[PDB]
């Protein structure tokens, strides 16, 4: 990793756990969803070692330090959605009926069904995701996809719509999809725990993929923020 090992695998579009270390740049970004250094703006160098620990490390709690994986913000059981609610919250997400059990940031906020009268407060930019699944298949489970991403980011995620009101999901070249998402922070009240832009959200997802703590049941290749 410091010299002479796996240089032929750095940036090879295939994640190799043997090369997944900060020294080898998370296998040249292949293990961090194409995010070079998710901690690039983090002021303390050893934060990634404390990212995975299930405890608050205040020195690593800044937005630049990826909120110490929300362990300072969500200190107790509220860190995760109840496993008994997994199917229920995915089935009832954004169905136009307020489901109180799902009405928490860790469960996906019920896809905002309990906050229809609160105006959208979008983060800057668009979250772009390459998923190795065709658009039709991806949209067949779109509620599950958005609910899970909303639960992970602890905020509300939705498909960016075009002028014709259609979801901005494009074919990837037959082999996958290029998914465009917006982040609605209308329920994200602020210390800090809210992504101000799409790149911040992409870096956080890259940091989870880097420490092997991203459990998203979709063939997600890469993430980026775009204006």
């Amino acid at each position, epitope marked *: 990793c410091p010299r002479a090992a796996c240089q032929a695998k750095r940036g090879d579009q295939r994640c190799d756990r043997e090369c997944n270390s900060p020294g080898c740049g998370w296998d040249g970004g292949d293990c961090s969803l194409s995010v070079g250094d998710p901690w690039r703006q983090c002021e303390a160098l050893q934060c990634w070692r404390l990212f*995975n620990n*299930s405890r608050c490390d205040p020195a690593c709690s800044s937005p630049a330090c990826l909120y110490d994986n929300f362990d300072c913000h969500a200190g*107790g*059981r509220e860190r*995760t959605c*109840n*496993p*008994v*609610y*997994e*199917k*229920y919250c995915a089935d009832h997400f954004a169905d136009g009926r307020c489901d*109180q*059990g799902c009405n928490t940031e860790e469960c996906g906020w019920d896809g905002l069904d309990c906050a229809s009268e609160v105006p959208a407060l979008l983060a800057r930019g668009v979250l772009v995701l390459t998923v190795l699944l065709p658009p039709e298949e991806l949209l067949r489970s779109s509620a599950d996809f958005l609910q899970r991403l909303s639960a992970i980011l602890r905020t509300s995620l939705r498909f960016r719509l075009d002028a014709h009101g259609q979801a901005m999901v494009f074919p990837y070249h037959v082999i996958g999809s290029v998914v465009m998402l917006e982040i609605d922070n209308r329920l994200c009240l602020q210390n800090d725990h809210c992504f101000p832009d799409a790149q911040s959200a992409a870096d956080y997802l890259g940091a989870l993929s880097a420490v*092997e*703590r991203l*459990d998203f049941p979709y063939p997600l290749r890469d993430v980026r923020g775009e204006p």
Partner: antibody, heavy 119, light 108 residues
Framework: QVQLVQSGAEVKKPGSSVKVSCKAS????????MHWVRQAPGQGLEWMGG????????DYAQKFQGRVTITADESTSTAYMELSSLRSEDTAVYYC????????????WGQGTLVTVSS | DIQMTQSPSSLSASVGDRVTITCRAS??????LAWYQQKPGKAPKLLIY???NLQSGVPSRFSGSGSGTDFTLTISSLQPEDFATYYC?????????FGQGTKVEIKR
């Protein structure tokens, strides 16, 4: 102090139904879950399903689909497990288990209810 | 389902021995793993929750470690009241699943 008290031992003929109850007391956490775990004689532990009485949301193990019904009465902090079309292989001790404010793991357990299914 | 594999299934040890029981999950469960103790004719008892948190009232000679797919229950200075069956349980995704159990007997 949290305490879980279950209904008494049951004896049933094959094809009959059983409904077991579990009363929780001493709890302060509103969104606690009540689970049903069974243990056949000399065997391990098997989760059947669970409920959060405050929200009424339930989840079951697929192998118990159609035969198990889990309900609760939030006002009495009581959970129920109903198991239908009883077979001799359903003979087991049925435990009620509850989590707490700090984990989803089974922090509290009832004393168990033996259900014997036989001719 | 997530399959939980415990090792050993049976263990003979003496009072004062340092005992290790391992639990392997079929897929990663992060740190969402609990350890239970069960004695004959009694209900299980929670010892450790979420891989490494010792339940209050449980002696400090019990400790849990691991993350991902591999977990360890360590009993330092095994005491007479520790002879029992131990189970690991993933609390990560439903259906909640348990290991097959490790029966700990006293050598004599």
């Amino acid at each position: 102090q949290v305490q879980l008290v279950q209904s008494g031992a049951e004896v049933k003929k094959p094809g009959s139904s059983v409904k077991v109850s579990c009363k929780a007391s001493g709890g302060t956490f509103r969104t606690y879950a009540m689970h049903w775990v069974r243990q056949a004689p000399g065997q391990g532990l098997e989760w059947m399903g669970g409920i959060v009485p405050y929200h009424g949301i339930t989840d079951y193990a697929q192998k118990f689909q159609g035969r198990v019904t889990i309900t609760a009465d939030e006002s009495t902090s009581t959970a129920y497990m109903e198991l239908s079309s009883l077979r001799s292989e359903d003979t087991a001790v049925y435990y009620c288990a509850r989590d707490d404010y700090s984990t989803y793991a089974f922090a509290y357990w009832g004393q168990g209810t033996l259900v014997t299914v036989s001719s | 389902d997530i399959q939980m594999t415990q090792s050993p299934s049976s263990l003979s040890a003496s009072v004062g021995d340092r005992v290790t029981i391992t639990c392997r999950a079929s897929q990663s469960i992060a740190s969402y793993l609990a350890w239970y103790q069960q004695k004959p004719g009694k209900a299980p008892k929670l010892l450790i929750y979420d891989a490494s948190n010792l339940q209050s009232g449980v002696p400090s000679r019990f400790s849990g470690s691991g993350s991902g797919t591999d977990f360890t229950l360590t009993i330092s200075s095994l005491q007479p009241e520790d002879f029992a069956t131990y189970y690991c349980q993933q609390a990560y995704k439903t259906p909640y699943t348990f290991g097959q159990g490790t029966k700990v007997e006293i050598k004599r």
